[PDB]
Amino acid sequence: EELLKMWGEELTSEASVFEVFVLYLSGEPNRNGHKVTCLPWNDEPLAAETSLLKEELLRVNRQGILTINSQPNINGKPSSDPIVGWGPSGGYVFQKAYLEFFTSRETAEALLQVLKKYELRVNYHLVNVKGENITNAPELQPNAVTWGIFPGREIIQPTVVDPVSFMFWKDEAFALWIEQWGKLYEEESPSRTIIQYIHDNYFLVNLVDNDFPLDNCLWQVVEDTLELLN
Amino acid sequence: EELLKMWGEELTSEASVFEVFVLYLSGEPNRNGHKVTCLPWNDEPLAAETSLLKEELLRVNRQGILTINSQPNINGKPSSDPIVGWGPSGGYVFQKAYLEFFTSRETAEALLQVLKKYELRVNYHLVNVKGENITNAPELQPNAVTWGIFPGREIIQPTVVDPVSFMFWKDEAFALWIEQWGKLYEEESPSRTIIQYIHDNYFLVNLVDNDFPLDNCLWQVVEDTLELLN
Numbered sequence A, B: 001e002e003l004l005k006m007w008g009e010e011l012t013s014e015a016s017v018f019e020v021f022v023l024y025l026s027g028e029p030n031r032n033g034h035k036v037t038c039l040p041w042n043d044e045p046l047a048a049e050t051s052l053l054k055e056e057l058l059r060v061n062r063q064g065i066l067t068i069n070s071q072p073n074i075n076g077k078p079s080s081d082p083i084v085g086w087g088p089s090g091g092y093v094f095q096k097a098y099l100e101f102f103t104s105r106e107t108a109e110a111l112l113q114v115l116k117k118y119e120l121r122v123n124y125h126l127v128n129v130k131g132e133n134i135t136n137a138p139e140l141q142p143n144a145v146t147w148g149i150f151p152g153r154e155i156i157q158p159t160v161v162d163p164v165s166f167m168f169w170k171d172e173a174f175a176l177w178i179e180q181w182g183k184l185y186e187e188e189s190p191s192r193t194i195i196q197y198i199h200d201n202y203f204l205v206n207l208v209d210n211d212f213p214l215d216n217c218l219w220q221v222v223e224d225t226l227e228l229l230n
């Protein structure tokens, strides 16, 4: 009853879903006065590194690019930074920019068309519930996205985007629609209709911008998809 | 006969050894008109990254800090750079500054005294033929000194300074004096005296500055040792 109170008692349209993600990312309550304190993929409030890319995420989600995971790029910041720092003291820490999101088939086709402009810079991975796995991943090999350099030590790379492990995550990612939000609504409801439509027709998408020394391209990539579509 | 022609037919003093290293590092011939084209540890001309730190090495060796291996610090330069670049195209490549050298016991004690000022920033390792291994190495663990970040890929760290492997290199490093320069001179020669003295009384020393984003400290560390000594 508390989940169904924050995610809306009944969805009017896709817009309702778009708002549930925008109200998770902003601090604002819905029209009923309740904050979206979690989503099926998160169960938590955001980690503090998202403070670096909040407005951007607001803008992206307001369009229907439904982000479920993210990362700022970090260019060798002090390992003591309370926002991004980790590991032993006196080192440096690094990140690639990363974005994980669901999309409509229409927006997925517009994104595949725009990713031709960014092919070598951005690793991408689109998939849907029937398969149709599309990725530019080198030989289906991991991509490092977080690492740290520490005094007297080897490099530590704690975090990766593996195209093989993503295909096990896919099975959670799409089933968390029906199993935790669909089964929350009535069987025959237009709400269930909406959620079953999103369970079937949407693409899960992952992007990684490999140029961590530069400004993040992923926001311009999505602006370029909304240009092409609009 | 060709080695003994370039390393000098007979050493007057330690100064003679100091000059053989300075004439390896500069392009200049000795007083006899012959270039030092190699040393016992190298068998080759320098790699092009030394162009970035030549004058510095000239200055260091002119004092008796006999460098046998070195590296500039590199802060995420294009992986396509003909000087420093390596691996797949479109990535970034990184280095810590590194210096490997022999020293007199007097200069080794002056360096141990000055390394107290740089303790956390500079990894150091001194050793001599009897043992007397001194290092600040974390739990006797490797230190990364070269690495690269490439699109779609994990980090590659091709090059390390391992405090355990250094103790196998030690046995070459000191024996290459007697086995390739000492046995080049006569048995009873003052030249053999000189080389046996350097085979026994000198310390092999390795330093690594871990702050690759900053200007290299190692040159000021050696200036600080020549201040203390002088």
Ligand SMILES: Nc1ncnc2c1ncn2[C@@H]1O[C@H](CSCC[C@H](N)C(=O)O)[C@@H](O)[C@H]1O
Pocket: A024, A025, A039, A042, A045, A046, A047, A048, A049, A050, A057, A067, A068, A069, A070, A071, A095, A145, A146, A158, A159
């Ligand atoms: N709905 C959502 N949209 C965008 N980002 C989200 C999100 N829910 C969680 N996140 C973010 O996803 C990230 C998980 S942590 C990612 C790993 C970490 N940056 C590393 O350094 O290895 C956090 O920043 C979290 O705030």
Ligand SMILES: Nc1ncnc2c1ncn2[C@@H]1O[C@H](CSCC[C@H](N)C(=O)O)[C@@H](O)[C@H]1O
Pocket: B024, B025, B039, B042, B045, B046, B047, B048, B049, B050, B057, B067, B068, B069, B070, B071, B095, B145, B146, B158, B159
């Ligand atoms: N006598 C000497 N003094 C100082 N440096 C030397 C030297 N003889 C060789 N070198 C240097 O030692 C280095 C060996 S290559 C070191 C590894 C490489 N920089 C990496 O990126 O992993 C070369 O730069 C070479 O020019």
